[PDB]
């Protein structure tokens, strides 16, 4: 049961940008979005794919725990925070692609494919480079499909161990205070058009949880901060957060 | 390896209060405090005891998971947030004593005693009410003894399941942002003199973790906010948080 609220389009308009925000009220089982069309349009997941990749890597033992260090390959890249050792927590935090390319190669195409099928994740197609298909390959997922996946994760219903799911949800921790907790993951797709930014996750309250998924046009990296800002603007408007 | 920095006493001085802050650098295995003596002075743990109590209740199945609802008994108490249903997460957040009294009674004195010895927790003494000894009974623990206990919890080395320790650490989540994560539990001892406030836990950074434990004189409930404020002033001074 979904409803369309075009009033949110304002928040995209003030920045002369466009996109979609999708919300799901878990208690009342009702969804909300500014654009039913784009809510169901499938895009490359980019770094939002770090969530299922982490789940699979943990469940298969490629990653022993959230403390295991994956040392820098010594190759200096454009993003400074990538040029150092990382564990699952910091690799998530800084979207360290090369670490997750390593995860992917260790997982392999066969097992990766099977797990994504079990997760009912997007179009379940990993055609392309084994360790970059989420950046320039065949996998596609929509905002509404992101919620469905994230809801399974929250309820520990995905086909991996409870432990693997708890660990990934820890690594998803983005913000917490006396009012709410946000567990989420950003995304930035640049290799295939249209260039877009992602933000997917949920908001924990004392007695409810609001799942969210948004994407927006991202012609340049200048507007990346708007991924979170526009989402929070919508959450505030809907009185979900102060 | 310990060092004493009396300069922190200022932060207590500005509020006509006194107390101790204890810091432990996990990477370097070095401790810091403003008062070596009071750091080793044992007090009633009060609501900081919700950490071990939670661990035991989970491991014994008294608490199935962090979602299980413990219903309000319909009795109206002085604390507004207590007069409602709670789970482990909200019970922690609001220090809901009556919930944890239930936990204790279901655990029983024999098993409770057994667990605290295994935890090597404080003086390991549960004299008093089976279900209020941490508020007005014989159990005592010092700031440094709190840290040692918390360090075990962090490393999943306590004699309970890994799952139980992960769930309690989830429930300890207090604050998170791009700079740090704080997992902690407040305490407020009023039934036995001297009345004191607690704050114990740790600060997670990208490359280190700082465990902390503080207590301070708390003649009235007016100064409760100082538990966090003073601790953070010390953290800022030592360049641990911005
Ligand atoms: Cl957490």
How far are the Cα atoms of A47, A91, A136, A139, B20 from residue A71, in angstroms, in the given order? 20, 11, 25, 28, 39
Residue B151: count other Cβ atoms within 10 Å of its Cβ.
15
Number of residues assigned to chain B: 242
Strands A30-33 vs A2-4: parallel, antiparallel or unpaired: parallel
Experimental method: X-ray
Please choose, from the candidates B85, B78, B114, the residue with its C-alpha nearest in 3D space to the C-alpha of residue B99: B85
Q: Could you give the angle at which helices A162-171 and A50-59 cross, rounded to 10 degrees? A: 140
Which chain B residue is nearest to residue A89, measuring alpha carbons?
Answer: B206
Q: How far apart are CA A239 and CA A163, in angstroms?
A: 33
A221: region left, alpha or beta (phi > 0 left; psi from -120 to 50 alpha): alpha
Q: How far apart are CA B93 and CA B87, in angstroms?
A: 10
CATH number at residue A45: 3.40.710.10
State the DSSP code for A76.
-
Q: Domain containing B115: what range?
A: 1-242
Please choose, from the candidates B192, B186, B239, the residue with its C-alpha nearest in 3D space to the C-alpha of residue B213: B186
Inter-residue contact B100 to B53 (CB < 8 Å): yes
Which chain A residue is nearest to residue B208, measuring alpha carbons?
Answer: A67
3-class DSSP assignment, residue B217: strand
**A89: its two tokens:** 């927590």
CB spacing of B166 vs A162 below 8 angstroms? no
In the numeric block, the tokens 């500005």 are attached to B14
Q: How far apart are CA A51 and CA A81, in angstroms?
A: 20
Residues of chain A with C-beta less than 8 angstroms from the C-beta of B163: 162-163, 166
- What's the number of domains chain A is made of? 1
Instruction: Check CB contact of A193 with chain B, cutoff 8 Å.
Output: no
Q: Which of A90, A166, A206 sits opposite B166 (nearest CB)?
A: A166
Inter-residue contact B54 to B63 (CB < 8 Å): yes
3-class DSSP assignment, residue A38: helix
Instruction: Check CB contact of B220 with chain A, cutoff 8 Å.
Output: no
State the DSSP code for B80.
G
| CA geometry: angle A63, B241, A240, nearest 5 deg | 75
**A28: its two tokens:** 């009342």
How far apart are the two ends of chain B, measured CA to CA in Å? 26
Instruction: Check CB contact of A69 with chain B, cutoff 8 Å.
Output: no
Q: How far apart are CA B227 and CA B242, in angstroms?
A: 18
Beta-bridge partners for B68: none
How many DSSP H helices and E strands does chain A contain? 10, 9
Please choose, from the candidates A224, A212, A218, the residue with its C-alpha nearest in 3D space to the C-alpha of residue A192: A218
Reported as half-sphere exposure (CB side, CA atoms, 13 A), residue A13 has a value of: 6
**A98: its two tokens:** 């090369």
Longest dimension (CA), chain A: 50
Please choose, from the candidates A111, A136, A110, A160, the residue with its C-alpha nearest in 3D space to the C-alpha of residue A49: A136
| Contacts of A107 by beta carbon, 8 Å cutoff, 6+ apart | A53, A56, A57, A60, A62, A115
How far apart are the two ends of chain A, measured CA to CA in Å? 26
State the DSSP code for A29.
T
3-class DSSP assignment, residue B139: coil
Residues of chain B with C-beta less than 8 angstroms from the C-beta of A176: 173-177, 181
Determine whether B47 is an active site residue. Answer: yes
| Contacts of A146 by beta carbon, 8 Å cutoff, 6+ apart | A22, A48, A200, A213
Min distance B6 CA to chain A CA atoms (Å): 31
Inter-residue contact A104 to A78 (CB < 8 Å): no
State the DSSP code for B195.
P
Q: Point out the catalytic residue in the list B47, B54, B164, B189.
A: B47
Inter-residue contact A217 to A19 (CB < 8 Å): yes
3-class DSSP assignment, residue B223: helix
Inter-residue contact A236 to A230 (CB < 8 Å): no
Strands B2-4 vs B30-33: parallel, antiparallel or unpaired: parallel
């Amino acid at each position: 049961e979904w409803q369309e609220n075009k009033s949110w389009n304002a928040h995209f308009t003030e920045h002369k940008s466009q996109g979609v925000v999708v919300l799901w009220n878990e208690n009342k089982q009702q969804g909300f979005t500014n654009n039913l069309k784009r809510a169901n349009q499938a895009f490359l997941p980019a770094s939002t794919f770090k969530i299922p990749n982490s789940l699979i890597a943990l469940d298969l033992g490629v990653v022993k725990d959230e403390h295991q260090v994956f040392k820098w390959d010594g190759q200096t890249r454009d993003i400074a925070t990538w040029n150092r050792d990382h564990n699952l927590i910091t690799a998530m935090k800084y979207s360290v692609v090369p670490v997750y390319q390593y995860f992917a190669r260790q997982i392999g195409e066969a097992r990766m494919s099977k797990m994504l099928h079990a997760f009912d994740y997007g179009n379940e197609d990993i055609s392309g480079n084994v360790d970059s298909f989420w950046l320039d390959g065949g996998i596609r997922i929509s905002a509404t499909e992101q919620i469905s996946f994230l809801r399974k994760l929250y309820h520990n219903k995905l086909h991996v161990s409870e432990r693997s799911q708890r660990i990934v949800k820890q690594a998803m921790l983005t913000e917490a205070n006396g009012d709410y907790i946000i567990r989420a993951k950003t995304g930035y797709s640049t290799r295939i058009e249209p260039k877009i930014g992602w933000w997917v996750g949920w908001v924990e309250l004392d007695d409810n949880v609001w799942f969210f998924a948004m994407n927006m046009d991202m012609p340049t990296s200048d507007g990346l901060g708007l991924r979170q800002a526009i989402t929070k603007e919508v959450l505030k408007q809907e009185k979900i957060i102060p």
